[PDB]
Point group: C3
Chain length 202, copies 3
């Protein structure tokens, strides 16, 4: 169930969600599946922040991606109440307090723990791990492990040289057949071996 | 849909939930309120000021300690079993007091408000905050347990807002100063209010 | 219904969940929705073991299935082994067991706490609402936050040693009835003397 889930690309119909190959969601049997993860994302506008998810990601049950930016609430105005979005004739002069946050971008090979919450506009680099229940309020670096609320640095998965090797080779770009030829290396800690294998194919 | 939605006043049936005008929930709202008995007038109530914005999946914890006494041998509420063997159990329930959310409060998505907490006017509760203690007027808090982040305005601006209490004005009066309401010009709104008195 | 909820022993069918008497869940979607990723058809997986007289708040989560096949130390965390893809046939199984999750007796789990895999929580512990318990919790310890951290102990070390001797959760409901005035009190020393006289 958490090992396989169901692939996200089949579950979504919102054009503002873009997801790469093989990425899956393990909360598939709850509610409406992956769609329930995605909060406040307008499907009928092309001028809103989108949710971009790389290939080969694993999203844990109940993860939340917060979209719609500041939801019309301006902390710096007298009131956070979104007057502009009330159908009230008295409030017709209200100014739009909506502020976009930018796209939410999740890299390739990202593992998002169960019930983590990703705040608007955050970028999570390739290979990162988001602990269960983390509240990610800032960008996460490639291969970084973070947790807590607000999420904070725990560690990196690999050495800086291994990270550079992974950033050069971009194994998620290879075909499944090419990944199948080097599956013994993919399922190992031998980053150096996989880098050498990739160079010999170039 | 987080910009508006169903106003809370129209979608509650629990007499122990009292909510001011225009406050809305972007999720219904009854599912936010945990363990609140709708048939008893001797329990902690949930009081919500006007012009509040409540994010999806926020939780307001009611029913106090739920009968669990951390100072007793066991936290198991023997008193609340129908078991004849426990007939002499002592009631462990301890009320927390009303939960009181002020006017113009923004409660982030999936924040949890613990029992008996007061959240002052104009406060902002970050998404996923766990609010275990009172929050001051115009204070921003986050994390678990929630901690101080910042104040939205200076002490003198807060005092101006506490004197003018714009949420008490009619929607018609608010429309007349809407350019100011949608600005950081708190002194301008204050001078505007004084000219109307 | 936070005060008595409904008993867990009667609302479970997953044989990998083992729960003591009187323990109840106050979000009755029932208690089984609290248990995440637990395979009910295998006997070689981590089990969920819950003592008697526990109180589990609404929406608590018990994370099972260990690392769910994700090896942080491998090139990728993507569980190639669990994809039915013919190209990934030589994939190695990344699953690592965490060990059983063990909740002691007389444990209060706050609403929407999450218990990570392999964790042991001692008798008498209190888990604050929304705590994320990433490591073992000691008997009669109170923890909270994310990750959970020590707050206090409910009783002194001498009182805790007394409670670990007498193990009142082992007594019958009838015996507990005979000392209910002491059970509903802070008089640990009094309950210990009562127990000594009953032996
Ligand atoms: Cl948290």
């Amino acid at each position: 169930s958490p090992f396989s889930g169901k692939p996200i690309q089949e579950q979504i119909t919102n054009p503002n969600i873009i997801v790469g190959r093989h990425s899956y969601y393990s909360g598939y049997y709850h509610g409406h599946g992956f769609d329930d993860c995605v909060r406040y994302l307008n499907p009928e506008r092309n001028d809103v922040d989108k949710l971009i998810i790389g290939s080969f990601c694993s999203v844990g049950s109940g993860a939340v991606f917060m979209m719609a930016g500041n939801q019309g609430h301006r902390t710096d105005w007298v009131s956070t109440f979104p007057f502009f979005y009330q159908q009230n004739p008295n409030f017709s002069e209200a100014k739009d307090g909506f502020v976009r946050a930018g796209d939410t971008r999740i890299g390739h090979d990202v593992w998002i723990g169960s019930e983590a919450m990703i705040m608007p506009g955050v970028t999570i680099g390739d290979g990162a791990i988001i602990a269960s229940r983390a509240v990610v309020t800032k960008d996460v670096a490639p291969y970084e492990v973070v947790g807590s609320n607000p999420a904070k640095h725990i560690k990196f998965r690999f050495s800086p040289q291994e990270i550079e090797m992974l950033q050069e080779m971009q194994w998620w770009q290879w075909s499944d057949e090419q990944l199948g030829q080097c599956m013994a290396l993919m399922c190992s800690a031998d980053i150096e071996g996989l880098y050498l294998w990739w160079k010999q194919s170039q």
